[PDB]
Amino acid sequence: PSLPPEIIVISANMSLEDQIKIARETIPIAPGAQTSEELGRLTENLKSFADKTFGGCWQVMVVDGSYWITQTFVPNMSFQFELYNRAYLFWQTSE
Amino acid sequence: PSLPPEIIVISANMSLEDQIKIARETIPIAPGAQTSEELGRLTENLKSFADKTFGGCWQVMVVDGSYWITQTFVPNMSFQFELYNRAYLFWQTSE
Numbered sequence: 001p002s003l004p005p006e007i008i009v010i011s012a013n014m015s016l017e018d019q020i021k022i023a024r025e026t027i028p029i030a031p032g033a034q035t036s037e038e039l040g041r042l043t044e045n046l047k048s049f050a051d052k053t054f055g056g057c058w059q060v061m062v063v064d065g066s067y068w069i070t071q072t073f074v075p076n077m078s079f080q081f082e083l084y085n086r087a088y089l090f091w092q093t094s095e
Numbered sequence: 096p097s098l099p100p101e102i103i104v105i106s107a108n109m110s111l112e113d114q115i116k117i118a119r120e121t122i123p124i125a126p127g128a129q130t131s132e133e134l135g136r137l138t139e140n141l142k143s144f145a146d147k148t149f150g151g152c153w154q155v156m157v158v159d160g161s162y163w164i165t166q167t168f169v170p171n172m173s174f175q176f177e178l179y180n181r182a183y184l185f186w187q188t189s190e
Contacts, residue, residue, distance in 0.1 A: 039163040047165040059167050065160015068134040070142040072154050072188060093167060 010080035010087065018054060019079055022090065025049050031084055046088075054092060061089040105175035105182065113149060114174055117185065120144050126179050141183075151190035158182040 003009065003016065007023050026046065033042045043060045050058035054077065064086055076092035098104065098111070102118050121141065128137045138155045145153040149172065159181055171187035 036163070043163050043165045047167070057167055058165070060165045062163040063158060063160055064162070065158055067156060067158045067160070068131065068138050069156045070138045070154055072142070072152055074154075 006083055008082040010082060011078065012080070013074070013076075013078045018077070019081075021053065022050070022079055023081075026088065027083060030086070030088070046090075050090065050092070055095055056092045057094040059089075059091040059093050061091075063087040063089070101178055103177040105177060106173065107175070108169070108171075108173045113172065114176075116148060117145070117174055117176075120148075121183065122178060125181070125183070141185075145185060145187070149187065152188045154184075154186045154188050156184040156186075158184070 001016075001020060003020055003023055004027065006027055009019070012019055029045070030042065033039050039062055043062055046060040047058045050060070056076070067087070074091075076095070077090070078092070079088075079090040081088055096111075096115065098115060099118055099122065101122060104114070107114060124140075125137065128134050134157055138157055141155045142153050145155070151171070162182070169186070171190065172185070173187070174183075174185040176183055
């Protein structure tokens with residue numbers, strides 16, 4: 001057990017186990033979605049996936065493009081990975 | 096007064112007054128930067144601007160592209176605007 005090659009990690013504060021099961025849930029339903037409500041309830045079923053599995057309130061952000069974040073202290077789990085040149089940002093916002 | 100026409104507001108939890116001074120500081124130095132060594136430390140002198148002016152720790156994310164966030168309760172000031180088709184996201188992470 002390791003992360004699929006399809007998934008390219010940008011950043012993680014997280015166990016591989018939790019990265020992997022984010023992997024498994026994401027890769028099948030993610031590439032189907034292309035314009036805006038495709039993605040709108042995609043993020044939402046990803047958020048709703050995390051809250052069920054990992055606990056707390058989660059924020060899921062999807063990006064088509066390139067980005068730059070200041071670095072600051074970020075308290076909860078965060079996972080950032082590219083799947084087929086589309087970025088996925090996960091933040092647990094509560095426990 | 097009002098916001099310059101260049102700035103297209105995506106979301107705000109903020110006074111116009113505080114939105115405007117983000118406009119003021121951003122528009123001159125933001126469009127100049129294209130490289131990652133530019134933008135990487137652009138976000139940073141934007142963050143470092145907000146922390147001095149508005150207080151607390153801020154997270155500034157710049158995007159070249161299109162994006163989708165889940166909707167959730169977001170506690171502090173947040174401003175999101177497009178300037179010359181490059182989006183700028185501000186989050187105060189503490190006060």
